[PDB]
Amino acid sequence: MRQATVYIDRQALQYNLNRVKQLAANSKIVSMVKANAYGHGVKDCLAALNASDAFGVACLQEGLEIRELGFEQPVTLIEGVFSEDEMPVAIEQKFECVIHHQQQFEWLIKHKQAYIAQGLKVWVKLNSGMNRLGFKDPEIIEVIKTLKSEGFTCVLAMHFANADVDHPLNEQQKQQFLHIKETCDPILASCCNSAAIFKWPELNFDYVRPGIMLYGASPFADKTVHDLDLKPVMTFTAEIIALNHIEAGEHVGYGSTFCAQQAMDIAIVSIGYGDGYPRAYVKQNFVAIDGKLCPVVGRVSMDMIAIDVTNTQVKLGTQVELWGNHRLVDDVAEANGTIGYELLCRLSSRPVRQGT
Amino acid sequence: MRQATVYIDRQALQYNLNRVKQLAANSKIVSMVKANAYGHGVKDCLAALNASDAFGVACLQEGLEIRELGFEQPVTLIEGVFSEDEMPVAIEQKFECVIHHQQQFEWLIKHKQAYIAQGLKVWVKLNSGMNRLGFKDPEIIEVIKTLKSEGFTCVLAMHFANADVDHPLNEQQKQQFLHIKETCDPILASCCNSAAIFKWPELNFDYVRPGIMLYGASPFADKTVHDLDLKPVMTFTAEIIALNHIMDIAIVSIGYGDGYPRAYVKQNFVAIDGKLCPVVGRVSMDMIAIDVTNTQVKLGTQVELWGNHRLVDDVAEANGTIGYELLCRLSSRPVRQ
């Protein structure tokens, strides 16, 4: 059979979760497992992340998947509910809801007795500048005041727009968050994503929300996972399916975008964009084979790529790493003009998934 | 429930398959349905493409899926088999194999009695300068003349590297192909992909192999599906989940976690009720933002990410790639209607 495989290392997941604990020692952890655990597979990741205090998801359906798999941890719906009829289900399954706008506020008050009797906190989202989701200052203060007076236990929640770099909007957001915290204390609070866990332990408060770092990929353009002491969780592999010796001046692939400047050995590998390996590169990309790095040559097709193996001993069937511990997913991303998060999330169903 | 939806228009599939019949009037059609029908879902495309003479796939698993869905059309494994132990299954399921290198030729000869007795053609792939898979000239002639001698029925097969453009390697590939066919005649022949179907009817021969055109996306960077008279098959949608007055901004329930592409080289757009609206700021994992200043919307309004009104090739061009890739790299999260 064609070999295209996605391996998920459970020990690395445990290790990176433990890194969160080391960096945010006095906070509960909301492990962000949305988008099928950032493409790593919930079935394969939840057990490894079972020491989490909570799991964070993008929608009710992701939360129902967690429950169906047998997991009883608190789950936070990080965008809240999209329709009122989700409220009874959320309450029954013990899913705490983010609220970010008036509509959800009205639905929550409507279901307040059952929601409160289930012991569920409400996460009240601040828009401090991103202008995506949330209540603005000062409206958020009245919302919180009202929820408290209605009998709710609240969590003040914000997300940083640019925690991954040095940016002036980070200070505007920190100060907006502390103003609201001060104004609404006593209150639980949560604002650290992976980047903020590394940079701002003073903002840990009661709950941190790591995502990308759990998966052993970097929240920072200028730091490797080795710099951060994280372990890559996913290895994405395929195999050599053809070998070809070509002469100077011969082209390779669709588009004939690559011309051989000397004679060379080419291997064809059984992966392409139909597996979720990215097509369009803005700098040279490499794969990892036999302890070496080999350049990807010419265009990536739906089902196949070509690599220059002139300098590397290979055979038919030789295993080729597209990313993992030897070719880092964030280096592949950078060559593709994007970020690791996206590569991890846009794999197709064609590769076989294997837990390790 | 969060709304993110993939719709597949069966009538559009049928229309486009008919465009193939119009442009390649006398050939059998191998509909290319690799990669889960270029992302469209084999369950929802094989029926619509049932009039296809054959289906083409990337691997044995994809062909097994076709049979599991109840389809008995001939299937061509377009890269052949990857391990020898695939051969008894290919034979049993009546999958024709490409052979492109010596290893596969050896495994085929080893299973000749059963393969021939099953009535299965062998598609012998020529490498004429694309430099991906294939036997070279003159080595391919030997392979073919041996297979004929063993009683196999052959198809001479080739793929164009640059059929989408004007390019001299197209002529080199053509002339090599014709030379090999002449030497090995009479012989069944196949070389046209979507671009080739549009451009070179003289090279249709016995089997044409439409892929992208079936789905109503363009094989040509410089031509729209309207120019080509193809109907978009996939509509990809989500809904407005929040509205903010800053401009009026709508937040939409799609992101790169759904397969909506993140990184753009120029301004992208969505369509709402047929009207283009700009995407603003960055695409996150679960959400995008759109400028609705000129456009009357509500919470819950359905937003077209691509389909008939925002063309997938336009989105792809803004993302620095081609439609094929976008169709292929959707996540499991959106509901397939």
Residue numbers in the entry:
A (entry chain A): 1 to 356
B (entry chain B): 1 to 246, 264 to 354
Direct quotes from the study:
Alanine racemase (EC 5.1.1.1) is a pyridoxal 5′-phosphate (PLP)-dependent enzyme which catalyses racemization between l-alanine and d-alanine. d-Alanine is an essential building block of peptidoglycan, a critical component of the bacterial cell wall. Alanine racemase (Alr) is the sole source of d-alanine in many bacteria and its inhibition is lethal, making the enzyme an attractive antibiotic drug target. Kinetic studies of Alr have indicated that racemization occurs via a stepwise two-base mechanism, in which a highly conserved lysine and a tyrosine residue act as acid and base catalysts. Each Alr monomer has two distinct domains: an α/β-barrel at the N-terminus and a predominantly β-stranded domain at the C-terminus.
We have reported the crystal structure of A. baumannii alanine racemase from the highly antibiotic-resistant NCTC13302 strain to 1.9 Å resolution. The tertiary structure of A. baumannii alanine racemase (AlrAba) is a homodimer in which the two monomers interact in a head-to-tail manner. The individual AlrAba monomers are crystallographically distinct and form a dimer in the asymmetric unit. Overall, the AlrAba structure is lacking clear density for residues 247–263 and 355–356 of monomer B. Missing density for these regions has previously been observed in alanine racemases from other species, including M. tuberculosis, B. henselae, S. aureus and O. oeni. The essential PLP cofactor is covalently bound to Lys34 via an internal aldimine linkage and extends towards the centre of the α/β-barrel. The pyridine N1 of the PLP ring is stabilized by hydrogen bonding to Arg209, which is further stabilized by interactions with His159. Arg132 usually interacts with the phenolic O atom (O3′) of PLP, aiding in maintaining the position of the cofactor. However, Arg132 was not within hydrogen-bonding distance of PLP in the AlrAba structure. The lack of substrate-like molecules in the active site could also be a contributory factor to the unusual position of Arg132 owing to this residue playing an integral role in substrate binding. AlrAba has a hinge angle of 141.6°, identical to that of DadXPao (141.6°) and very similar to that of AlrEco (140.4°), to which it has the most similar active-site architecture.
